[PDB]
Amino acid sequence: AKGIREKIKLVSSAGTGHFYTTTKNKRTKPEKLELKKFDPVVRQHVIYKEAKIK
Amino acid sequence: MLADKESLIEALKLALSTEYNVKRNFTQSVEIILTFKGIDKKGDLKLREIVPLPKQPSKAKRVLVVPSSEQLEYAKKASPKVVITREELQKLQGQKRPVKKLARQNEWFLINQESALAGRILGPALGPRGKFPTPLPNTADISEYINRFKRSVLVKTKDQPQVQVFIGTEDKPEDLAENAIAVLNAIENKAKVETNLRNIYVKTTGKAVKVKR
RNA sequence: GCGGAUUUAGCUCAGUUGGGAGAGCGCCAGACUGAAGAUCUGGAGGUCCUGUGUUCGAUCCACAGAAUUCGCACC
RNA sequence: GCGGAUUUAGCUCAGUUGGGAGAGCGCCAGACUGAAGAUCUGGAGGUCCUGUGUUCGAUCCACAGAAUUCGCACCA
RNA sequence: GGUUCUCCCCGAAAGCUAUUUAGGUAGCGCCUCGUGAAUUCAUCUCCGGGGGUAGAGCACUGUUUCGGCAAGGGGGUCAUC
RNA sequence: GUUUAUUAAAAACACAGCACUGUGCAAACACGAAAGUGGACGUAUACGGUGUGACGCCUGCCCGGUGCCGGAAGGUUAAUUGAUGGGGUUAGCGCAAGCGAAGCUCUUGAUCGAAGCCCCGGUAAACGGCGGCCGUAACUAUAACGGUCCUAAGGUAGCGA
RNA sequence: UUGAGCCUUGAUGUGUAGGAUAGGUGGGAGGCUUUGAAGUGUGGACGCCAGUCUGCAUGGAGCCGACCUUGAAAUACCACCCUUUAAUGUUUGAUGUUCUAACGUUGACCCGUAAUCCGGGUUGCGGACAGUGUCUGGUGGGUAGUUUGACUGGGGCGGUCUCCUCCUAAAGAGUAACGGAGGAGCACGAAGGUUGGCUAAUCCUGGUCGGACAUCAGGAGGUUAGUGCAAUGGCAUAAGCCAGCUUGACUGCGAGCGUGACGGCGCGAGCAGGUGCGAAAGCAGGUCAUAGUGAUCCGGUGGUUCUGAAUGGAAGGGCCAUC
């Protein structure tokens, strides 16, 4: 976003729902490392790839 | 994508014109072509796509069958190309000429599980020019397994640069582009490489169309 | 008073992840010289300022203290 | 990160028939010398940048990643 | 810079936040004037405990000194600092 | 000398040579919008920069820095020139979702590219500049004699307030 | 002479088996045959030897192919496929190299003209030069400009509004000074949870691989402990703990309000959907929290049933993302 050792943005969209958001991750440590189950449709927590496909 | 229906419609309307359908002596054929760029030995772009044409053309397919005695009385009725029994496979054990005939001019070799001699007597004749056999169901009521194979083709390459497969005949290019895109879907489903395009054409019993895309 | 360098080999001084202590030079040996330096090849040479804490481990860093020392404050 | 090239010894780098992986300077040891330098010769020398796929066989062919690196995006 | 005739009560205008403030600025009053209203509001006697202004101790942590010894540590001597 | 009448009355200095320097000549300067008039009725020993400090000697040296510029072996990467990729705008092809061509156009930082300047060459008048600790003379201590530190570096061509 | 395209003209290959001089990518199993069309047979002449040439047959017989053999791999019959680059045609450009009706004539002859401007033609010169108009480059204080906080025991310094704790300053609140101590320019691939778990040291004595030490079984039972950079405070039915299971930290409204000056900052009875957490009682909006951003105006940008001066597409706006 501006720096190097930085708290950055990354575009996390849904496993079904099309919807996107972000808040934080960091290039400072290894990266192969996130998805979740969550839901911005709220109906059924199942699959959510993060900005990153883990 | 590889292509879409209208960019295949517009080019089969070309393929079945006299420009590209140069006529020999019979009701003639048309095909869907894909040649690849960076196509090499690794595996991620290698294919086997056994594809029943979603709208079948005028010239059906070369289906051999090997039924067991119970279902035979029905298999007798599904309009198979040629037939051999679960039994008489025991006699084909050495006969090169019959084997090379069947290999060279049939396309699909549908075989019951009890017929496992089938795994031995055909491979080295059929295999090198890429057509395949398959486990026929045990039922009497067999008909849509036969009808499917009597309208299917295959994406043969194991390591080589091109596909080109039968997809239509002389009379209705529009439906035949729903055949054409089905082969392309099998491919983009089996090989997510996409930019490995050299070219996409369509082709008759001779002349090929350098498609609009 | 604040901030800073600094008390690391005879000599000039380098050095730090934060776990080895360095080099031009000087000494000494090995020999070449009757001898010594050069030039040589090998060995060696440390108040790492002190305390404390972090810490695997402090020469280092932070904190507290000595003591030199530098600029500005002073009119 | 866009794309390309590059990464093989301490460093510069050969590495394109896929079959033995190495030269140069310098390091080392002998010869030479009175000692070294220089000349001469032998000897040393690797995360083949990473790691799998393909291969009978991989520095070599494919790809995902990285660092070295050239030009380069940019009206949040 | 300076109230160009008179009169009477409310009426310190003259301050909290500040302000790339320097007698300059946003709302604002403790103001009046026009609507509106309730025990609304203040001191007392009372309810009820948090405060730490005092004060006081030696409790802590920091220690006065004087006794009495707390494998602490000094001076002397044999001794190998 | 009568000079900046107006602070000094020169204790300012206007001289005047010259290495270099501006221009092989519609020459430099251009006041004026159009002059081509100074310089010219004239040539780089005429005329202009920036100065000069009698006269005559004398201008050591020293290029680290910064001037002055001048160049081209080659990198930074602009007008100039435009590989392309992505689109727009749209025929053809689609019961639809939508694909999708010329032409026209949007948009590349394609690839050259040295003003500067890394650079390369020369500058004594271009900018200013002369380093410290450890050991010292048949006496104090003078400070010749000393090993060196990648430190840019210690008073030098004098006469001594 | 040199750039970009295009085959009019070319040409960069020997190893064996295959009666035989085999780039490929591929379909399938047949392909030609009107006699002046096809091979197939056999001489003869050339040589940069890998090229061809010229004669004469026979010829509706069948011959080339999966079909029979061989091998690293077929070859009959069509599709597909031109580039590293030459020769020259056919599109077409551009630096040098120049000649010279541009041009400039502030050079001369001739000429109107007893003429300094000026008229004009021959000549003589150089040369597409000049010219200026934009874009890129710095070059220097040659017009014009500002005198930009305030803090001032009068100024030059050193320190602060910031957003922050402890002093200092007179309790609801505050009131510095070139004053006294010390400060944020940020923090997760978890420092993420809902169950469950408690008892640790130091030193005394034990004992493989010591020579301070590190899991240990017991002293005494001491409420003699710990703090990853900073700090002050937590306070123990432990949050410090740490192994299993595994990452709600919902989309939407809210009586009631705590309140302020436009942002804002705080949360909650109760109602919805069904939301995930649970045996059951039942709980709740994430790193230990204190330190972390935009007056807002302009920007940019990605999505849309929100619109858009007669419309229809639609600029531009709305919604809210994204900064």
PDB file of all heavy atoms in Angstrom, chain G residues 259-269:
ATOM      1  P     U G 259     -25.530  11.591  31.193  1.00  0.00           P
ATOM      2  OP1   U G 259     -24.757  12.016  32.367  1.00  0.00           O
ATOM      3  OP2   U G 259     -26.936  12.092  31.113  1.00  0.00           O
ATOM      4  O5'   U G 259     -24.706  12.085  29.840  1.00  0.00           O
ATOM      5  C5'   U G 259     -25.330  12.913  28.862  1.00  0.00           C
ATOM      6  C4'   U G 259     -24.648  12.847  27.492  1.00  0.00           C
ATOM      7  O4'   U G 259     -25.611  12.427  26.501  1.00  0.00           O
ATOM      8  C3'   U G 259     -24.144  14.187  26.976  1.00  0.00           C
ATOM      9  O3'   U G 259     -23.083  14.802  27.748  1.00  0.00           O
ATOM     10  C2'   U G 259     -23.882  13.778  25.503  1.00  0.00           C
ATOM     11  O2'   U G 259     -22.544  13.439  25.160  1.00  0.00           O
ATOM     12  C1'   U G 259     -24.969  12.671  25.243  1.00  0.00           C
ATOM     13  N1    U G 259     -25.971  13.123  24.214  1.00  0.00           N
ATOM     14  C2    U G 259     -26.001  12.513  22.940  1.00  0.00           C
ATOM     15  O2    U G 259     -25.301  11.572  22.582  1.00  0.00           O
ATOM     16  N3    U G 259     -26.850  13.029  22.011  1.00  0.00           N
ATOM     17  C4    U G 259     -27.761  14.022  22.254  1.00  0.00           C
ATOM     18  O4    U G 259     -28.510  14.407  21.362  1.00  0.00           O
ATOM     19  C5    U G 259     -27.714  14.586  23.581  1.00  0.00           C
ATOM     20  C6    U G 259     -26.823  14.183  24.512  1.00  0.00           C
ATOM     21  P     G G 260     -22.983  16.412  27.714  1.00  0.00           P
ATOM     22  OP1   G G 260     -21.859  16.867  28.513  1.00  0.00           O
ATOM     23  OP2   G G 260     -24.274  16.969  28.085  1.00  0.00           O
ATOM     24  O5'   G G 260     -22.591  16.678  26.193  1.00  0.00           O
ATOM     25  C5'   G G 260     -23.238  17.655  25.496  1.00  0.00           C
ATOM     26  C4'   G G 260     -22.490  17.771  24.195  1.00  0.00           C
ATOM     27  O4'   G G 260     -22.687  16.533  23.549  1.00  0.00           O
ATOM     28  C3'   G G 260     -23.058  18.752  23.154  1.00  0.00           C
ATOM     29  O3'   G G 260     -22.739  20.101  23.401  1.00  0.00           O
ATOM     30  C2'   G G 260     -22.431  18.175  21.866  1.00  0.00           C
ATOM     31  O2'   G G 260     -21.087  18.512  21.591  1.00  0.00           O
ATOM     32  C1'   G G 260     -22.440  16.680  22.141  1.00  0.00           C
ATOM     33  N9    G G 260     -23.434  15.966  21.283  1.00  0.00           N
ATOM     34  C8    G G 260     -24.716  15.527  21.572  1.00  0.00           C
ATOM     35  N7    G G 260     -25.485  15.201  20.552  1.00  0.00           N
ATOM     36  C5    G G 260     -24.609  15.383  19.488  1.00  0.00           C
ATOM     37  C6    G G 260     -24.810  15.292  18.084  1.00  0.00           C
ATOM     38  O6    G G 260     -25.781  14.880  17.448  1.00  0.00           O
ATOM     39  N1    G G 260     -23.732  15.711  17.355  1.00  0.00           N
ATOM     40  C2    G G 260     -22.581  16.184  17.872  1.00  0.00           C
ATOM     41  N2    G G 260     -21.633  16.493  17.038  1.00  0.00           N
ATOM     42  N3    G G 260     -22.312  16.246  19.157  1.00  0.00           N
ATOM     43  C4    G G 260     -23.378  15.855  19.918  1.00  0.00           C
ATOM     44  P     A G 261     -23.273  21.371  22.561  1.00  0.00           P
ATOM     45  OP1   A G 261     -22.111  22.262  22.392  1.00  0.00           O
ATOM     46  OP2   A G 261     -24.463  21.895  23.235  1.00  0.00           O
ATOM     47  O5'   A G 261     -23.775  20.845  21.181  1.00  0.00           O
ATOM     48  C5'   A G 261     -24.548  21.614  20.239  1.00  0.00           C
ATOM     49  C4'   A G 261     -23.805  21.905  18.900  1.00  0.00           C
ATOM     50  O4'   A G 261     -22.609  22.693  19.039  1.00  0.00           O
ATOM     51  C3'   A G 261     -23.450  20.547  18.230  1.00  0.00           C
ATOM     52  O3'   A G 261     -23.751  20.533  16.844  1.00  0.00           O
ATOM     53  C2'   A G 261     -21.949  20.565  18.463  1.00  0.00           C
ATOM     54  O2'   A G 261     -21.190  19.859  17.541  1.00  0.00           O
ATOM     55  C1'   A G 261     -21.656  22.040  18.278  1.00  0.00           C
ATOM     56  N9    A G 261     -20.312  22.466  18.696  1.00  0.00           N
ATOM     57  C8    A G 261     -19.405  21.791  19.482  1.00  0.00           C
ATOM     58  N7    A G 261     -18.232  22.374  19.588  1.00  0.00           N
ATOM     59  C5    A G 261     -18.292  23.334  18.585  1.00  0.00           C
ATOM     60  C6    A G 261     -17.423  24.322  18.035  1.00  0.00           C
ATOM     61  N6    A G 261     -16.185  24.587  18.339  1.00  0.00           N
ATOM     62  N1    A G 261     -17.761  25.072  16.976  1.00  0.00           N
ATOM     63  C2    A G 261     -18.982  24.950  16.519  1.00  0.00           C
ATOM     64  N3    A G 261     -19.917  24.122  16.913  1.00  0.00           N
ATOM     65  C4    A G 261     -19.529  23.354  17.983  1.00  0.00           C
ATOM     66  P     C G 262     -25.187  20.245  16.386  1.00  0.00           P
ATOM     67  OP1   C G 262     -25.893  21.536  16.250  1.00  0.00           O
ATOM     68  OP2   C G 262     -25.734  19.214  17.256  1.00  0.00           O
ATOM     69  O5'   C G 262     -24.997  19.637  14.949  1.00  0.00           O
ATOM     70  C5'   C G 262     -24.061  18.570  14.765  1.00  0.00           C
ATOM     71  C4'   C G 262     -23.696  18.362  13.284  1.00  0.00           C
ATOM     72  O4'   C G 262     -22.846  19.438  12.852  1.00  0.00           O
ATOM     73  C3'   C G 262     -22.764  17.160  13.031  1.00  0.00           C
ATOM     74  O3'   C G 262     -23.324  15.899  12.709  1.00  0.00           O
ATOM     75  C2'   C G 262     -21.876  17.522  11.834  1.00  0.00           C
ATOM     76  O2'   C G 262     -22.316  17.043  10.575  1.00  0.00           O
ATOM     77  C1'   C G 262     -21.971  19.043  11.806  1.00  0.00           C
ATOM     78  N1    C G 262     -20.690  19.777  11.951  1.00  0.00           N
ATOM     79  C2    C G 262     -20.177  20.440  10.820  1.00  0.00           C
ATOM     80  O2    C G 262     -20.689  20.252   9.728  1.00  0.00           O
ATOM     81  N3    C G 262     -19.132  21.324  10.911  1.00  0.00           N
ATOM     82  C4    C G 262     -18.580  21.514  12.058  1.00  0.00           C
ATOM     83  N4    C G 262     -17.551  22.305  12.035  1.00  0.00           N
ATOM     84  C5    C G 262     -19.019  20.867  13.233  1.00  0.00           C
ATOM     85  C6    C G 262     -20.048  19.947  13.174  1.00  0.00           C
ATOM     86  P     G G 263     -23.707  14.837  13.854  1.00  0.00           P
ATOM     87  OP1   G G 263     -23.966  13.473  13.359  1.00  0.00           O
ATOM     88  OP2   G G 263     -24.673  15.476  14.751  1.00  0.00           O
ATOM     89  O5'   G G 263     -22.400  14.685  14.733  1.00  0.00           O
ATOM     90  C5'   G G 263     -21.377  13.754  14.392  1.00  0.00           C
ATOM     91  C4'   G G 263     -20.532  14.186  13.213  1.00  0.00           C
ATOM     92  O4'   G G 263     -19.299  14.762  13.611  1.00  0.00           O
ATOM     93  C3'   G G 263     -20.164  13.096  12.234  1.00  0.00           C
ATOM     94  O3'   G G 263     -21.216  12.611  11.448  1.00  0.00           O
ATOM     95  C2'   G G 263     -19.238  13.915  11.380  1.00  0.00           C
ATOM     96  O2'   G G 263     -19.939  14.803  10.537  1.00  0.00           O
ATOM     97  C1'   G G 263     -18.466  14.698  12.438  1.00  0.00           C
ATOM     98  N9    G G 263     -17.169  13.995  12.646  1.00  0.00           N
ATOM     99  C8    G G 263     -16.853  13.166  13.680  1.00  0.00           C
ATOM    100  N7    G G 263     -15.723  12.525  13.549  1.00  0.00           N
ATOM    101  C5    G G 263     -15.271  12.903  12.288  1.00  0.00           C
ATOM    102  C6    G G 263     -14.084  12.527  11.569  1.00  0.00           C
ATOM    103  O6    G G 263     -13.192  11.729  11.880  1.00  0.00           O
ATOM    104  N1    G G 263     -14.006  13.145  10.340  1.00  0.00           N
ATOM    105  C2    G G 263     -14.894  14.056   9.868  1.00  0.00           C
ATOM    106  N2    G G 263     -14.493  14.800   8.865  1.00  0.00           N
ATOM    107  N3    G G 263     -16.014  14.403  10.500  1.00  0.00           N
ATOM    108  C4    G G 263     -16.158  13.794  11.717  1.00  0.00           C
ATOM    109  P     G G 264     -21.732  11.134  11.615  1.00  0.00           P
ATOM    110  OP1   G G 264     -22.053  10.676  10.275  1.00  0.00           O
ATOM    111  OP2   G G 264     -22.754  11.134  12.683  1.00  0.00           O
ATOM    112  O5'   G G 264     -20.449  10.311  12.031  1.00  0.00           O
ATOM    113  C5'   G G 264     -20.281   9.769  13.310  1.00  0.00           C
ATOM    114  C4'   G G 264     -19.095  10.347  14.086  1.00  0.00           C
ATOM    115  O4'   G G 264     -19.476  11.474  14.844  1.00  0.00           O
ATOM    116  C3'   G G 264     -18.582   9.375  15.136  1.00  0.00           C
ATOM    117  O3'   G G 264     -17.653   8.414  14.684  1.00  0.00           O
ATOM    118  C2'   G G 264     -17.950  10.295  16.181  1.00  0.00           C
ATOM    119  O2'   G G 264     -16.720  10.837  15.760  1.00  0.00           O
ATOM    120  C1'   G G 264     -18.917  11.457  16.163  1.00  0.00           C
ATOM    121  N9    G G 264     -20.073  11.349  17.086  1.00  0.00           N
ATOM    122  C8    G G 264     -21.325  10.841  16.776  1.00  0.00           C
ATOM    123  N7    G G 264     -22.288  11.102  17.616  1.00  0.00           N
ATOM    124  C5    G G 264     -21.551  11.772  18.613  1.00  0.00           C
ATOM    125  C6    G G 264     -22.011  12.330  19.851  1.00  0.00           C
ATOM    126  O6    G G 264     -23.140  12.279  20.329  1.00  0.00           O
ATOM    127  N1    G G 264     -21.012  12.842  20.656  1.00  0.00           N
ATOM    128  C2    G G 264     -19.770  13.071  20.164  1.00  0.00           C
ATOM    129  N2    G G 264     -18.963  13.859  20.776  1.00  0.00           N
ATOM    130  N3    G G 264     -19.272  12.645  19.038  1.00  0.00           N
ATOM    131  C4    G G 264     -20.228  12.008  18.275  1.00  0.00           C
ATOM    132  P     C G 265     -17.613   6.982  15.411  1.00  0.00           P
ATOM    133  OP1   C G 265     -16.461   6.223  14.923  1.00  0.00           O
ATOM    134  OP2   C G 265     -18.935   6.365  15.252  1.00  0.00           O
ATOM    135  O5'   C G 265     -17.498   7.151  17.005  1.00  0.00           O
ATOM    136  C5'   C G 265     -16.299   7.562  17.680  1.00  0.00           C
ATOM    137  C4'   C G 265     -16.480   7.608  19.221  1.00  0.00           C
ATOM    138  O4'   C G 265     -17.518   8.527  19.491  1.00  0.00           O
ATOM    139  C3'   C G 265     -16.895   6.272  19.842  1.00  0.00           C
ATOM    140  O3'   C G 265     -15.783   5.414  20.111  1.00  0.00           O
ATOM    141  C2'   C G 265     -17.638   6.744  21.084  1.00  0.00           C
ATOM    142  O2'   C G 265     -16.713   6.980  22.151  1.00  0.00           O
ATOM    143  C1'   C G 265     -18.229   8.091  20.631  1.00  0.00           C
ATOM    144  N1    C G 265     -19.710   8.045  20.316  1.00  0.00           N
ATOM    145  C2    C G 265     -20.636   8.239  21.325  1.00  0.00           C
ATOM    146  O2    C G 265     -20.291   8.572  22.460  1.00  0.00           O
ATOM    147  N3    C G 265     -21.960   8.220  21.024  1.00  0.00           N
ATOM    148  C4    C G 265     -22.379   7.995  19.792  1.00  0.00           C
ATOM    149  N4    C G 265     -23.664   7.855  19.686  1.00  0.00           N
ATOM    150  C5    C G 265     -21.473   7.744  18.739  1.00  0.00           C
ATOM    151  C6    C G 265     -20.157   7.861  19.030  1.00  0.00           C
ATOM    152  P     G G 266     -16.005   3.865  20.383  1.00  0.00           P
ATOM    153  OP1   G G 266     -14.733   3.195  20.755  1.00  0.00           O
ATOM    154  OP2   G G 266     -16.789   3.363  19.234  1.00  0.00           O
ATOM    155  O5'   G G 266     -17.042   3.845  21.638  1.00  0.00           O
ATOM    156  C5'   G G 266     -18.146   2.937  21.653  1.00  0.00           C
ATOM    157  C4'   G G 266     -18.819   2.979  23.030  1.00  0.00           C
ATOM    158  O4'   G G 266     -19.427   4.264  23.173  1.00  0.00           O
ATOM    159  C3'   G G 266     -19.872   1.887  23.256  1.00  0.00           C
ATOM    160  O3'   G G 266     -19.424   0.800  24.050  1.00  0.00           O
ATOM    161  C2'   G G 266     -20.847   2.678  24.155  1.00  0.00           C
ATOM    162  O2'   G G 266     -20.489   2.798  25.529  1.00  0.00           O
ATOM    163  C1'   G G 266     -20.751   4.114  23.641  1.00  0.00           C
ATOM    164  N9    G G 266     -21.733   4.357  22.570  1.00  0.00           N
ATOM    165  C8    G G 266     -21.633   4.499  21.202  1.00  0.00           C
ATOM    166  N7    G G 266     -22.747   4.795  20.565  1.00  0.00           N
ATOM    167  C5    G G 266     -23.684   4.810  21.615  1.00  0.00           C
ATOM    168  C6    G G 266     -25.132   4.906  21.647  1.00  0.00           C
ATOM    169  O6    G G 266     -25.943   5.115  20.745  1.00  0.00           O
ATOM    170  N1    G G 266     -25.682   4.733  22.910  1.00  0.00           N
ATOM    171  C2    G G 266     -24.945   4.485  24.012  1.00  0.00           C
ATOM    172  N2    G G 266     -25.507   4.439  25.168  1.00  0.00           N
ATOM    173  N3    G G 266     -23.648   4.255  24.008  1.00  0.00           N
ATOM    174  C4    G G 266     -23.064   4.459  22.798  1.00  0.00           C
ATOM    175  P     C G 267     -18.668  -0.457  23.503  1.00  0.00           P
ATOM    176  OP1   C G 267     -17.473  -0.597  24.334  1.00  0.00           O
ATOM    177  OP2   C G 267     -18.513  -0.240  22.037  1.00  0.00           O
ATOM    178  O5'   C G 267     -19.636  -1.695  23.896  1.00  0.00           O
ATOM    179  C5'   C G 267     -20.947  -1.824  23.396  1.00  0.00           C
ATOM    180  C4'   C G 267     -22.037  -1.261  24.334  1.00  0.00           C
ATOM    181  O4'   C G 267     -22.567  -0.043  23.818  1.00  0.00           O
ATOM    182  C3'   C G 267     -23.291  -2.108  24.203  1.00  0.00           C
ATOM    183  O3'   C G 267     -23.240  -3.339  24.929  1.00  0.00           O
ATOM    184  C2'   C G 267     -24.481  -1.227  24.611  1.00  0.00           C
ATOM    185  O2'   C G 267     -24.906  -1.417  25.977  1.00  0.00           O
ATOM    186  C1'   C G 267     -23.882   0.180  24.397  1.00  0.00           C
ATOM    187  N1    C G 267     -24.800   1.032  23.548  1.00  0.00           N
ATOM    188  C2    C G 267     -26.046   1.420  24.065  1.00  0.00           C
ATOM    189  O2    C G 267     -26.300   1.291  25.244  1.00  0.00           O
ATOM    190  N3    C G 267     -27.038   1.933  23.308  1.00  0.00           N
ATOM    191  C4    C G 267     -26.790   2.082  22.029  1.00  0.00           C
ATOM    192  N4    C G 267     -27.645   2.690  21.311  1.00  0.00           N
ATOM    193  C5    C G 267     -25.616   1.646  21.392  1.00  0.00           C
ATOM    194  C6    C G 267     -24.648   1.101  22.172  1.00  0.00           C
ATOM    195  P     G G 268     -23.993  -4.637  24.363  1.00  0.00           P
ATOM    196  OP1   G G 268     -23.478  -5.864  24.934  1.00  0.00           O
ATOM    197  OP2   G G 268     -23.995  -4.574  22.917  1.00  0.00           O
ATOM    198  O5'   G G 268     -25.458  -4.347  24.924  1.00  0.00           O
ATOM    199  C5'   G G 268     -25.943  -4.756  26.172  1.00  0.00           C
ATOM    200  C4'   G G 268     -27.413  -4.345  26.405  1.00  0.00           C
ATOM    201  O4'   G G 268     -27.585  -2.930  26.264  1.00  0.00           O
ATOM    202  C3'   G G 268     -28.394  -4.997  25.449  1.00  0.00           C
ATOM    203  O3'   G G 268     -28.522  -6.377  25.682  1.00  0.00           O
ATOM    204  C2'   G G 268     -29.637  -4.096  25.695  1.00  0.00           C
ATOM    205  O2'   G G 268     -30.362  -4.310  26.946  1.00  0.00           O
ATOM    206  C1'   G G 268     -28.842  -2.784  25.656  1.00  0.00           C
ATOM    207  N9    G G 268     -28.674  -2.341  24.269  1.00  0.00           N
ATOM    208  C8    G G 268     -27.760  -2.738  23.338  1.00  0.00           C
ATOM    209  N7    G G 268     -27.984  -2.214  22.157  1.00  0.00           N
ATOM    210  C5    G G 268     -29.124  -1.451  22.281  1.00  0.00           C
ATOM    211  C6    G G 268     -29.864  -0.573  21.414  1.00  0.00           C
ATOM    212  O6    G G 268     -29.630  -0.099  20.309  1.00  0.00           O
ATOM    213  N1    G G 268     -30.950  -0.038  22.022  1.00  0.00           N
ATOM    214  C2    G G 268     -31.431  -0.452  23.176  1.00  0.00           C
ATOM    215  N2    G G 268     -32.534   0.121  23.541  1.00  0.00           N
ATOM    216  N3    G G 268     -30.813  -1.246  24.032  1.00  0.00           N
ATOM    217  C4    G G 268     -29.603  -1.630  23.555  1.00  0.00           C
ATOM    218  P     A G 269     -29.790  -7.141  25.007  1.00  0.00           P
ATOM    219  OP1   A G 269     -29.630  -8.596  25.009  1.00  0.00           O
ATOM    220  OP2   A G 269     -29.993  -6.493  23.692  1.00  0.00           O
ATOM    221  O5'   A G 269     -30.855  -6.813  26.135  1.00  0.00           O
ATOM    222  C5'   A G 269     -32.185  -7.281  26.011  1.00  0.00           C
ATOM    223  C4'   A G 269     -32.942  -6.998  27.333  1.00  0.00           C
ATOM    224  O4'   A G 269     -32.944  -5.552  27.533  1.00  0.00           O
ATOM    225  C3'   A G 269     -34.418  -7.453  27.377  1.00  0.00           C
ATOM    226  O3'   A G 269     -34.627  -8.612  28.175  1.00  0.00           O
ATOM    227  C2'   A G 269     -35.178  -6.216  27.940  1.00  0.00           C
ATOM    228  O2'   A G 269     -35.293  -6.225  29.332  1.00  0.00           O
ATOM    229  C1'   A G 269     -34.285  -5.022  27.562  1.00  0.00           C
ATOM    230  N9    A G 269     -34.590  -4.461  26.213  1.00  0.00           N
ATOM    231  C8    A G 269     -33.700  -4.070  25.253  1.00  0.00           C
ATOM    232  N7    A G 269     -34.263  -3.646  24.155  1.00  0.00           N
ATOM    233  C5    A G 269     -35.622  -3.780  24.408  1.00  0.00           C
ATOM    234  C6    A G 269     -36.794  -3.403  23.724  1.00  0.00           C
ATOM    235  N6    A G 269     -36.883  -2.847  22.531  1.00  0.00           N
ATOM    236  N1    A G 269     -37.993  -3.545  24.275  1.00  0.00           N
ATOM    237  C2    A G 269     -38.078  -4.094  25.474  1.00  0.00           C
ATOM    238  N3    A G 269     -37.065  -4.541  26.214  1.00  0.00           N
ATOM    239  C4    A G 269     -35.848  -4.295  25.644  1.00  0.00           C
TER     240        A G 269
END
